[PDB]
């Protein structure tokens, strides 16, 4: 039901600990029928992918690498910042996330990083870039024989 | 009644010309069904058969045997390629293409029957193999050919445009900026927006 994904059990399952405005009832999986306003409440996404973002249950919040504290300088530090493989879904958290937290501020950032690649892969001669990267090597490797049988 | 065109008519549409008259229907299908014709099933199997029987007459030569043969081959790996592609296109797009077919019953221009026999072959294999995947206690409300399954609603094959039309800025249908057209240059786009010029074949593809 998706622009599908390889890790459909790690696709919407990376976890965040948003606080709470109001009371709780019977979490089931957790140590739970009522808990506090404001708590480190572990929250693996999928159920809250469409769970009434406007409602008085949860608040403005971020896992703070995804907060401006890193990234809003990673747009100034967009020069030789490395990402490795770390927080992997980092071209793509916001493809869901960005409004859903409803801090109206970080839509620019991810684009601002990855539109850099219009001038990263001139010198080229995450879990998603892997495909196109392989392809970039491959097409030239076969353009090699587009010369000849070589 | 309306004869005397460069189609298979009362004249010679050259093997090297007939090479052209079907060439772009292949070269477009890369960078994206575009409207399909079963007419070639009358054309190619006929024309090549005539040369085939001529070669079946001229199966004694060394040379022209081989020339007609190499010709045939260079013609034939593309006629392979067409459905070598389209089977993928709708094996992929078995999902919601039937919406288009129940919208318009697309005529000889657009679709073809055997494609729509893939509807049979699809639902048969999928549901009768699913018959042993999850049918013991199969679904409760979304029990049929399911809701969520689609291959390609993205009309977004971002595409290079073969400029071969009016070298002045012939401004035409596209939902992004269309200013400043010409016979060489281009304003690159996706497929979503020009379903128009190539249904006209006004414009072209690289």
């Amino acid at each position: 039901p998706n622009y599908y994904s390889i890790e459909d059990i790690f696709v919407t399952q990376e976890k965040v600990e948003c606080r709470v405005n109001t009371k709780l009832q019977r979490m089931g999986f957790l140590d739970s029928d009522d808990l506090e306003p404001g708590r480190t409440v572990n929250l693996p996404l999928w159920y809250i992918k469409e769970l009434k973002v406007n409602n008085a249950y949860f608040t403005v919040a971020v896992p703070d690498i995804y907060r401006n504290v890193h990234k809003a300088v990673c747009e100034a530090e967009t020069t030789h910042i490395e990402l490795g493989r770390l927080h992997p879904y980092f071209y793509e958290f916001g493809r869901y996330l960005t409004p859903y937290d409803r801090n109206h501020v970080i839509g620019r950032i991810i684009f601002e990083t990855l539109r850099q690649r219009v001038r990263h892969l001139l010198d080229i001669s995450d879990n998603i870039e892997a495909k196109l990267h392989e392809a970039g090597v491959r097409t030239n490797s076969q353009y090699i024989e587009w010369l000849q049988m070589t | 009644g309306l004869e005397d065109e460069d189609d298979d008519d009362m004249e010679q549409i050259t093997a090297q010309k007939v090479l052209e008259i079907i060439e772009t229907a292949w070269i477009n299908e890369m960078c994206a069904i575009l409207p399909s014709q079963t007419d070639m099933l009358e054309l190619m199997v006929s024309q090549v058969a005539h040369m085939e029987e001529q070669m079946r007459d001229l199966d004694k030569n060394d040379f022209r045997a081989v020339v007609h043969s190499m010709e045939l081959e260079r013609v034939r790996y593309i006629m392979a390629s067409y459905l070598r592609c389209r089977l993928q296109k709708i094996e992929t797009f078995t999902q919601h293409i039937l919406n288009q077919e129940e919208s318009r019953e697309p005529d000889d221009k657009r679709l073809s029957p055997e494609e729509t026999k893939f509807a049979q072959e699809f639902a048969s294999n999928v549901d009768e193999y699913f018959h042993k995947v999850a049918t013991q206690y199969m679904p409760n409300q979304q029990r049929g050919e399911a809701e969520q399954r689609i291959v390609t609603p993205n009309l977004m094959s971002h595409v290079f445009l073969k400029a071969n039309v009016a070298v002045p800025a012939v401004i035409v249908g596209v939902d992004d900026e269309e200013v400043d057209m010409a016979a060489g240059s281009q304003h690159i786009i996706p497929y979503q927006l020009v379903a128009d010029l190539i249904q006209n074949n006004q414009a072209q593809l690289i």
Binding site: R108, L114, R119, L122 | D62, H158, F160, I189
Partner: protein, 179 residues
């Protein structure tokens, strides 16, 4: 996007060559061709010279852009190529392959030829890394074909567009941006 996709294409082009035997065991294949006479040149598509030069049958000399001075002048003509330049047949980088493969067993100077054309190919493609360092800001409606050739654009065809899609997810809402 392939090595022989072009060779399904470029050898379709036809040029005046020499045959050195006359019309074959059959006289003429019907089509644009006329029949064959030794010592009398004939224009044909180029996917026969395979079956002549490898068959030890006849020679061929090329078109005229396939020579020294014209290309030793286009080498400076493309100074204007801040878009593009002169285009002698727009496939001289593919034909030259199969030409210079077997033809130059008898042809004069297959080398300065080879030298300049490699000296022209990649250098026109350096344009295509550099001019891409001009490309910014979702410019779908900006591009360049004006005198592009045939053999190059495939070498970027597979990559950026299958990137630029899930860019183009972002290339209505409130003050913040949307995709």
């Amino acid at each position: 996007m392939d090595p022989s996709i072009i060779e399904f294409i470029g050898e379709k082009c036809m040029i005046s060559i020499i045959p050195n035997f006359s019309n074959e065991p059959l006289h003429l294949i019907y089509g644009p061709v006329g029949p064959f006479r030794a010592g009398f040149p004939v224009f044909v598509p180029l996917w026969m010279a395979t079956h002549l030069r490898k068959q030890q049958k006849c020679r061929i000399v090329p078109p005229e852009w396939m020579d020294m001075d014209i290309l030793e002048e286009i080498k400076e003509e493309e100074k204007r190529s801040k878009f593009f330049t002169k285009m002698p047949c727009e496939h001289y980088m593919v034909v030259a392959q199969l030409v210079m493969s077997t033809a130059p067993d008898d042809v004069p100077r297959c080398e300065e030829l080879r030298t300049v054309i490699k000296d022209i190919f990649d250098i026109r493609e350096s344009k295509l890394r550099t001019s891409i360092d001009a490309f910014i800001k979702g410019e779908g409606t900006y591009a360049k074909l004006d005198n592009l050739t045939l053999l190059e654009i495939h070498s970027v065809r597979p990559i950026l567009p299958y990137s630029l899609d899930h860019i183009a997810r972002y290339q209505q809402r409130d003050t913040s941006m949307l995709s």
